[PDB]
Structures are given as C-alpha cells and as structure tokens.
Amino acid sequence: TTADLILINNWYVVAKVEDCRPGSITTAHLLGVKLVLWRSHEQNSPIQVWQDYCPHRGVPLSMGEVANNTLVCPYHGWRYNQAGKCVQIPAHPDMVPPASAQAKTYHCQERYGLVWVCLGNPVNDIPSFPEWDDPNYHKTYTKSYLIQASPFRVMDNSIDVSHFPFIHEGILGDRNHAEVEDLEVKVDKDGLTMGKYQVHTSTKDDSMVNWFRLSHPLCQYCSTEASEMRTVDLMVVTPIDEDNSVLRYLIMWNGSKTLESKILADYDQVIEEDIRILHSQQPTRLPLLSPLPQEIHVPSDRCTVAYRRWLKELGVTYGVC
Amino acid sequence: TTADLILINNWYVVAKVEDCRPGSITTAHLLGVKLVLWRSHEQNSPIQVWQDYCPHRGVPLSMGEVANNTLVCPYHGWRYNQAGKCVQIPAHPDMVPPASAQAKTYHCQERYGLVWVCLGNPVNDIPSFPEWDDPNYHKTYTKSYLIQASPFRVMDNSIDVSHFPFIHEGILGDRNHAEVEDLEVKVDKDGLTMGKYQVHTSKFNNSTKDDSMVNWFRLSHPLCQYCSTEASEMRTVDLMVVTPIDEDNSVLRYLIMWNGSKTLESKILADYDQVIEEDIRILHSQQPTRLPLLGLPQEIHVPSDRCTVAYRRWLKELGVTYGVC
Amino acid sequence: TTADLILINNWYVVAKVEDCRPGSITTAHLLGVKLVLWRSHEQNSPIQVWQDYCPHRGVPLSMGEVANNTLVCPYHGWRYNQAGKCVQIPAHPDMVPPASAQAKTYHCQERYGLVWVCLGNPVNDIPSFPEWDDPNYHKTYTKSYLIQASPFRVMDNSIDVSHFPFIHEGILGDRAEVEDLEVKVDKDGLTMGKYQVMVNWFRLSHPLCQYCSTEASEMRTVDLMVVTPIDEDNSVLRYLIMWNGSKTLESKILADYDQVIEEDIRILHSQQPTRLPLLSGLPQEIHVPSDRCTVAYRRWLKELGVTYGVC
Ligand code: FES
Ligand code: FES
Numbered sequence: 001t002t003a004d005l006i007l008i009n010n011w012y013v014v015a016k017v018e019d020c021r022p023g024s025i026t027t028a029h030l031l032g033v034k035l036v037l038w039r040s041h042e043q044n045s046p047i048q049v050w051q052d053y054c055p056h057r058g059v060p061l062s063m064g065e066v067a068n069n070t071l072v073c074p075y076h077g078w079r080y081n082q083a084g085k086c087v088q089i090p091a092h093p094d095m096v097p098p099a100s101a102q103a104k105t106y107h108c109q110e111r112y113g114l115v116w117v118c119l120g121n122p123v124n125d126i127p128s129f130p131e132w133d134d135p136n137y138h139k140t141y142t143k144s145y146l147i148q149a150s151p152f153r154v155m156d157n158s159i160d161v162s163h164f165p166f167i168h169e170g171i172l173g174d175r176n177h178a179e180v181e182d183l184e185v186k187v188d189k190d191g192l193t194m195g196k197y198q199v200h201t202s203t204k205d206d207s208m209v210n211w212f213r214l215s216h217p218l219c220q221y222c223s224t225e226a227s228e229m230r231t232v233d234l235m236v237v238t239p240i241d242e243d244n245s246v247l248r249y250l251i252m253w254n255g256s257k258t259l260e261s262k263i264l265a266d267y268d269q270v271i272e273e274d275i276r277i278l279h280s281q282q283p284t285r286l287p288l289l290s291p292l293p294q295e296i297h298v299p300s301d302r303c304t305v306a307y308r309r310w311l312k313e314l315g316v317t318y319g320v321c
Numbered sequence: 322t323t324a325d326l327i328l329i330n331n332w333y334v335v336a337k338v339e340d341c342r343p344g345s346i347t348t349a350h351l352l353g354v355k356l357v358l359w360r361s362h363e364q365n366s367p368i369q370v371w372q373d374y375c376p377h378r379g380v381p382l383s384m385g386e387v388a389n390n391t392l393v394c395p396y397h398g399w400r401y402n403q404a405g406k407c408v409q410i411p412a413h414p415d416m417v418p419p420a421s422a423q424a425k426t427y428h429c430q431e432r433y434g435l436v437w438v439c440l441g442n443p444v445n446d447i448p449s450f451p452e453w454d455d456p457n458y459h460k461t462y463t464k465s466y467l468i469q470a471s472p473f474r475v476m477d478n479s480i481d482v483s484h485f486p487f488i489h490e491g492i493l494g495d496r497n498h499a500e501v502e503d504l505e506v507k508v509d510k511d512g513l514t515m516g517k518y519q520v521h522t523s524k525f526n527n528s529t530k531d532d533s534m535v536n537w538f539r540l541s542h543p544l545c546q547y548c549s550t551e552a553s554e555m556r557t558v559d560l561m562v563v564t565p566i567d568e569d570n571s572v573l574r575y576l577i578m579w580n581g582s583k584t585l586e587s588k589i590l591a592d593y594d595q596v597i598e599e600d601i602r603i604l605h606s607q608q609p610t611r612l613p614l615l616g617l618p619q620e621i622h623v624p625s626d627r628c629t630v631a632y633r634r635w636l637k638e639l640g641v642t643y644g645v646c
Numbered sequence: 647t648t649a650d651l652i653l654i655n656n657w658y659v660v661a662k663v664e665d666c667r668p669g670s671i672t673t674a675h676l677l678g679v680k681l682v683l684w685r686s687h688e689q690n691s692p693i694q695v696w697q698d699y700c701p702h703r704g705v706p707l708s709m710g711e712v713a714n715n716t717l718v719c720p721y722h723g724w725r726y727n728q729a730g731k732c733v734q735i736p737a738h739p740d741m742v743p744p745a746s747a748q749a750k751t752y753h754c755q756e757r758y759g760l761v762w763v764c765l766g767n768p769v770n771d772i773p774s775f776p777e778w779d780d781p782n783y784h785k786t787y788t789k790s791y792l793i794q795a796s797p798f799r800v801m802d803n804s805i806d807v808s809h810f811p812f813i814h815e816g817i818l819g820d821r822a823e824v825e826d827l828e829v830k831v832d833k834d835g836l837t838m839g840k841y842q843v844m845v846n847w848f849r850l851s852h853p854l855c856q857y858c859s860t861e862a863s864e865m866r867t868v869d870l871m872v873v874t875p876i877d878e879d880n881s882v883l884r885y886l887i888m889w890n891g892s893k894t895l896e897s898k899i900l901a902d903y904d905q906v907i908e909e910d911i912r913i914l915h916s917q918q919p920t921r922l923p924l925l926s927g928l929p930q931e932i933h934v935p936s937d938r939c940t941v942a943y944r945r946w947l948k949e950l951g952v953t954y955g956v957c
C-alpha cells in the first residue's frame with residue numbers, strides 16, 4: 001500500500017503449496033495488504049490470491065466457503081468465480097451482478113512447491129533454482145517463522161557471516177575460530193553475489209565452502225559444500241509490512257535421505273538463534289548508509305554494507321530508515 | 322469529544338435501571354466521555370450522571386462513596402451534592418468551597434426501565450415505545466453486548482434483512498430460499514421506516530403450522546430502532562438501543578415485549594442471543610470499522626440494500642461525521 | 647533524551663547495590679534511556695552504567711557476557727573495557743578497534759546502598775541523608791514499586807498532606823482538619839515546616855528525592871524517598887527507612903509503608919491527565935489552603951523549567 005513501486009512489482013512467497021490444498025481457504029499478509037488464498041475441491045485446481053475483502057459490505061472473504069468453483073462470502077452469499085467476478089447474488093437470482101461486483105485479484109504462480117504472489121505488474125520472473133530439476137538432489141521445507149522485525153533486517157542478518165561463531169556456536173562455527181577471511185562481494189545488474197568463503201564446523205580440515213546470491217532483495221540462493229555432500233537452499237522472506245516478516249526455506253541436498261531430519265533441526269536451531277537477535281535490534285527497520293548511534297562498519301561487514309548500498313539505489317524506503 | 326452536535330444533543334441508554342440500586346456507583350462511557358452514575362441510599366432516589374472526574378486533583382469520583390446524599394471523592398473527601406456542587410471540604414470544614422469545585426453534570430431520565438442520558442441540551446424526546454404501558458404485553462431485557470464496531474455499523478446490520486438466509490440460517494431462513502422481495506423504505510419527518518416484509522422462518526415444530534413472520538420497524542433516532550414482529554398467533558415488539566461508546570465501539574441492548582404466554586421469556590432471550598452473536602461475528606470483521614457513507618473499494622449497493630442505503634443517506638442529512646467515513 | 651537539562655544533570659536511583667553483584671549484568675530505565683549496569687568478577691570492582699546499545703548493529707549489550715573485565719556483545723563478540731572502549735573485535739583480532747567503537751557511558755556513584763546515576767554532567771551532589779552516618783539508627787529498604795504514573799505525580803502525592811485521613815485511615819490519620827502549613831522554596835529546595843499528624847516535616851533538595859522526618863512519643867523515623875523517572879508516564883518508587891527505636895520493629899515498619907504505598911498507588915494509577923499539571927480530565931486543577939505545599943511544588947517545577955513528565 002505505502003510500499004515503493006519497486007517492491008510492489010516483485011514476486012514474493014506467501015505460502016507453501018502444501019498448506020493450500022483443494023477446497024481450502026487460507027490467509028496471508030503482504031506489504032500491508034490482507035490476502036485470501038483459495039482453491040476448488042478439484043485435484044490440481046489452481047490457487048487464487050485475492051485481497052481479503054468482499055466489496056459489497058467489507059467482510060473478509062476468508063470467512064466464506066468454497067463451493068462449485070466459486071468463493072462465497074458469508075454475509076449475503078455472493079459467489080465469485082475463479083477470475084474474481086461475482087456470478088450469483090442470491091437476493092436477486094436473475095440479476096446479472098454489476099461490473100463493480102468483482103474481487104481484487106493478484107498475480108499468482110506456483111513454483112518449487114511455493115506459492116508466489118505479485119501485487120502489481122511483475123517486471124521480473126520468479127528467481128531460478130537450478131537444483132529443483134536435478135534428480136540427484138533430495139528436497140525439504142522448513143516451517144514458516146513469524147518474525148517481529150523488518151524483512152530487510154531479516155535478510156541483513158542472513159547476509160552477515162561474521163556472527164556464526166557467536167550465536168551459531170556448534171553448528172556453523174565456534175569461538176576458537178572467529179576470525180574472518182577477506183570476503184569477495186559483487187553487486188551488479190544480476191544482484192548481490194558473495195564469493196566462495198570458508199566456514200569452520202564440527203575436506204582439508206573441519207571447514208565448508210559457501211557462497212550465496214541475491215537476484216532480488218528478499219530472496220537468497222545459498223550453496224554449501226561438505227566433503228562429498230552439496231546442500232543448496234532458497235531463502236525467501238515475506239514482507240508482511242515494514243516491521244514484520246515471514247521466513248521460509250526450500251532446502252535441497254545430494255547426500256543421504258537420512259539427513260533430512262538433521263537438516264531440519266539444524267535450521268530450526270540457527271533460525272531461533274537469529275530471531276533472538278533480530279527481535280532485540282533497534283531500530284526495527286534496517287538503517288541505510290549515511291548519504292541511536294549510527295551503525296559502525298568494519299571489513300567483515302562488507303557484504304552487509306553492499307546490501308544497504310544496493311537497497312538505497314533500488315530506492316527502497318519501506319521497512320528501512 | 323469530537324462528536325457532532327446532532328449526536329451530543331440526543332438521548333442514549335447507558336444502563337438498565339434495575340442495575341443501579343439505591344446507594345450505588347456505576348460507570349459508563351458515552352461519546353468518548355467517562356460517566357459516573359450514583360444514587361442516594363433513599364428508596365426512589367434519582368440517578369445523577371456526571372463526568373467521572375474530581376477537578377481538585379483529577380481522580381475519578383466513581384472510586385469514592387455515597388453518603389448523606391453526596392458523592393465523596395476518596396482522595397481528600399470533598400462532598401458533592403445532587404447538583405454536583407461541592408458543599409464541604411474536610412480539610413477546612415468551616416470554609417465555603419470555591420465555586421469552581423463543581424462536577425460536570427448531565428441530563429438523565431429513566432424510561433422503560435433504562436437510564437437515558439443526554440450530554441448536551443436535549444432537543445428531542447426519548448423515542449416512543451407504545452406498548453410499554455400495555456398490560457397485555459410482558460417485558461424482558463437482553464444482557465448488554467459490548468461490540469468492537471462503530472455504533473452506526475451495528476445499526477446498519479440491524480436494518481439489513483438480506484443477510485437472514487446466510488448468517489441466521491436455521492432460524493431466519495435457509496440458503497436455498499434467499500430471494501428478497503422488493504422492500505418499502507420511507508425517510509420522512511418520522512425518521513426511517515421499513516414497511517411490512519414477510520420473513521420465511523425455518524421449520525422447528527413439525528406438528529405446528531409455518532410461523533409466517535411479518536416485520537416492520539422504525540427509527541426516529543439513528544441509534545434506536547423500534548421493531549414490530551407479527552407471528553402465527555403472537556405479536557412481539559422490541560426497542561433496540563445502541564450506546565455509542567466512541568467512534569469504534571458500541572453497546573447493544575434490547576427491550577423485548579410480547580403478548581403471548583410469559584413462559585416464552587427464556588425462549589425469546591435465547592433466540593435473540595443466537596442471532597445477535599451471529600451478527601457480532603460479522604460486525605467484528607467488517608472493514609473499514611466506521612460506516613462508509615454514500616485504499617478499500619467503495620461499497621456496492623443492489624436493490625435488496627434499499628433500506629441500508631436510505632440509512633446512509635439519512636446520516637448525511639443529519640450531518641453525522643462521528644463513527645462514519 | 648527529550649528530558650530537560652535540569653533533569654539530565656541530577657542524580658537518580660536506578661538499583662540497589664546488593665542487586666549489582668560481581669560479574670552481574672542488570673538493566674534499568676532512566677528518562678527514556680535504556681541502561682545496562684555491570685561489574686567485573688573482581689571483588690570490589692566498580693559499577694559501569696552504559697546505554698544498553700552495541701553501536702555495531704544495535705543489539706542490547708545487556709544480552710551479553712562479562713569476561714576478563716570486559717562486557718562482550720553476544721552478536722559479534724566485541725569486547726568493551728570498563729571505560730566503554732571496544733578493545734577487541736574477534737573477526738579482525740590483529741586490528742585496533744576504531745574510535746567510534748565506544749559505549750555511551752554515564753556517571754554512577756554508590757551511596758546509602760543505592761546505585762545513583764547522572765546521564766548528564768554532575769553539578770550538584772547526591773542529596774544529603776544525615777542519619778546514614780548515625781549508628782543509633784537502624785536501616786531498612788522497601789521493595790521497589792513500578793508505577794504507571796508520571797514521576798512528578800508520584801512525588802506530588804508525597805507532598806500532599808491532606809489525604810492522610812482518607813486513604814490512609816488507620817495508619818496515618820482518621821476521618822480530617824489540616825493545620826496551617828509552612829512552605830519555604832529557596833536555594834535549599836522545597837521545605838515543609840514541622841506539622842502535627844506525631845510531628846512530621848520534609849525537605850526536597852531536588853524535585854524527585856524527598857527527605858522526611860517523623861518524631862513519635864518514643865522514637866524518630868526518617869526516610870529517603872527516591873523516585874526513578876523511567877519516562878514521562880512511568881516511575882519506580884523506593885524508600886530507605888531509618889529509625890532509632892528497637893531493631894525488632896523492622897517487620898511492622900515495612901508492613902505499614904507497604905500498606906500506605908499501595909493505597910497511594912491506587913490513586914496515582916487513576917489520575918488524569920497522566921502528567922502533572924503545572925500552574926497556568928478536561929477541567930483545570932483547583933487549589934485550597936491545605937494545598938500550599940503541593941502549589942509550591944508545581945511553582946518550583948515551572949521556575950526550574952521542567953517540561954518532561956508535566957502537563
Ligand atoms: S458483504 Fe459479501 S455478500 Fe454482502
Ligand atoms: S482529588 Fe477529589 S478531593 Fe482531592
């Protein structure tokens with residue numbers, strides 16, 4: 001609503017396809033807009049994403065029911081077809097509903113088992129995820145995490161690597177290996193790419209090789225390679241509004257399928273360790289570079305500074321300060 | 322208080338008389354103003370309705386006591402008489418209190434077992450309720466319902482009749498039978514009147530005839546509604562009264578009267594409760610929370626909305642800007 | 647931070663010294679600023695009081711860990727020494743931390759068993775409390791009371807004497823005439839003359855600390871009432887109480903104070919508006935002769951230029 005056109009015109013994940021099943025009604029919130037998500041009882045029916053608002057008298061359509069490939073609002077029973085047009089008004093069953101009688105519909109695309117939404121007119125496509133079609137990679141999904149922090153602070157914390165030995169001790173690092181190597185960062189028209197850097201953990205030694213790339217500011221493609229196992233993930237942040245976010249991960253890996261529950265637990269521990277910091281930080285919104293006291297930057301922050309720099313040019317004013 | 326003068330100079334119910342016993346101290350809220358209502362320990366004492374504020378040091382007078390026909394603020398024990406004029410300060414008991422030690426008082430009338438209050442000069446009368454004095458009619462009162470919606474939304478839902486087959490399915494209709502007949506709506510000198518309209522009720526007792534309900538209602542005031550319901554062998558009338566707490570919050574009460582057997586009173590209360598709670602579910606979710614008058618897309622109107630539309634037009638005529646958008 | 651300079655440059659109690667143990671990290675809130683209060687593990691190490699803020703990425707340092715005379719940010723492990731200078735950045739262990747890597751520190755002193763804080767520059771000293779040096783007097787501390795009231799309303803209720811017979815009936819008065827009162831506002835601050843209740847008087851050298859004296863037919867009890875201004879609309883109340891009667895009456899003294907206190911708090915929580923009205927709920931305050939001390943306090947605050955927590 002008060003978000004910049006550059007965010008309104010991008011794709012974001014609002015749900016996993018698994019939490020929307022045939023006949024269901026679910027709700028989401030994206031950039032200050034309340035959304036209703038529904039499908040027909042039909043197997044493989046498409047997913048509609050609309051503003052959660054019946055235009056007759058302002059009741060949430062989410063409180064309605066799916067019946068006969070239509071969503072029926074629960075106040076006066078108007079029925080809206082899959083295109084959002086009202087097709088039956090029960091008070092006047094032979095009146096053709098006025099043209100006005102139409103739900104606000106949004107672009108929706110199902111990809112990687114994720115439900116993607118764009119509130120405006122999409123200028124880019126949904127980010128790539130090459131491993132999706134690779135049969136030697138297994139896949140899994142975290143649950144969704146509600147976070148009381150800017151979406152841009154969520155991504156800022158995910159781009160920050162020097163904190164691993166301190167809040168992620170025992171999984172991504174340890175206090176006896178806290179020094180950070182030179183980090184190569186490039187911001188270009190592709191997006192922000194951080195070059196391969198090395199993580200101490202639990203083939204030369206107890207370390208891993210990681211890189212990541214952001215084609216868009218709220219979706220991150222990460223890669224980590226162990227001795228004989230590669231894991232990749234798509235991290236994707238729902239910007240609920242300027243101060244609140246949903247975090248989800250799609251995770252694929254080419255090692256044993258027995259690692260799934262271990263990966264799920266590792267992510268849950270790391271995410272919760274991050275949330276404790278994120279909820280604590282002030283200000284709530286992500287501070288941008290100088291064009292309480294101003295944020296200080298040392299060399300291991302060069303990727304975080306590049307992110308703030310990239311947001312400034314991108315003209316992001318929403319959820320930042 | 323940002324309430325329009327139209328609203329300020331009208332009467333509203335803030336309590337049931339039977340809940341304000343002699344010697345009692347009650348609180349309420351009306352149009353953004355906090356109120357204290359207190360009575361003398363004497364039988365048949367009048368009710369005083371004042372702003373709940375001691376102007377000495379800003380404590381609520383409702384936290385004090387009633388004694389010797391005065392309200393006493395507990396902080397320093399200043400004593401306020403029926404007219405609000407403080408008559409004694411215990412720290413200087415032979416001194417005459419300053420003339421500014423005066424409670425802000427309001428107009429109060431008891432009518433139909435209800436406490437009516439006007440925070441400004443009461444232009445209008447309390448609405449009529451002709452069957453009050455008719456001894457063929459028994460009386461009962463619902464509980465009060467605190468509702469997180471604008472008072473004008475609460476009343477607009479009350480005027481809406483096309484929602485009966487959906488959120489009142491099982492008692493005021495069914496989805497299958499949902500067509501609405503065209504309605505007659507008048508907005509004259511008498512306020513807003515909806516003419517007689519048939520209501521298809523849902524079958525409960527199969528030994529009995531279909532009820533075949535006929536209703537009409539009038540609003541002389543925008544937050545008080547008089548409804549008349551002719552049944553199979555029973556007339557029921559009700560005065561529906563909406564207290565405007567502020568622009569976004571309301572209290573709903575009904576005074577119900579009927580000329581059938583007095584044994585139905587539990588029946589009637591339970592049936593009103595079930596339909597009120599289904600309306601409150603809808604009212605609590607509606608957006609925007611203030612009532613739109615004639616971000617979010619504007620409201621749509623179809624012919625079934627004739628009554629509602631007339632209500633919104635009436636509110637603009639009256640100049641209502643409080644609780645509306 | 648939006649607080650007036652005259653308030654910035656005075657001392658306030660934020661804690662009891664016994665709650666600041668070696669190695670500990672605690673928090674407080676003062677004039678809208680959030681504070682961290684910690685000590686090294688060395689016996690007789692001093693108390694540091696900083697703004698609870700890591701300047702790197704805005705994390706509360708009070709979520710950190712005290713190590714080797716340093717406070718360690720939990721997020722990237724930066725270590726701050728007892729002067730609040732960042733001594734170590736673990737990602738660059740061979741690098742001199744830059745000058746801006748520096749905690750905002752404040753003045754702190756211990757006195758009367760309390761932790762006193764000045765967020766600005768200390769011109770006056772911590773108020774006097776003569777009986778502290780008098781070993782004929784035993785001492786005791788109430789618990790702290792968090793109050794949803796302006797600190798100046800809290801103190802105003804403490805300088806109103808006419809309400810004793812009404813909300814404190816049974817301990818402090820009985821239902822009520824008030825004697826002519828003596829109030830003296832000069833350099834010494836605000837002083838109220840000896841008055842019978844039992845004979846009481848009190849002094850405020852500063853606007854949020856009060857020294858009160860009560861003499862009974864057998865003993866003298868004094869107390870230092872020190873209110874913490876958390877913000878414009880919130881206060882912490884504490885009392886240090888000293889008496890020269892038997893040491894066995896500590897229980898009952900503390901029960902009496904707790905009893906009257908909660909009685910005062912019932913009133914304070916209900917008062918409107920929240921902030922104390924100075925002399926200039928919709929209607930204006932009215933004053934009668936027994937308000938002479940509370941009138942003097944409002945006058946004193948406006949001559950001082952207090953705008954925070956008032957009207
Ligand atoms: S509000 Fe949706 S049908 Fe009337
Ligand atoms: S505040 Fe009511 S008598 Fe003092």
Ligand code: FES
Pocket residue numbers: 700701702703704705719720721722723724
């Ligand atoms: S936030 Fe404190 S060290 Fe980075």
Ligand SMILES: [Fe+3]
Pocket residue numbers: 157158163168270274
């Ligand atoms: Fe992390």
Ligand SMILES: [Fe+3]
Pocket residue numbers: 478484489596600
């Ligand atoms: Fe209804």
Ligand SMILES: [Fe+3]
Pocket residue numbers: 803809810814906910
């Ligand atoms: Fe008191």
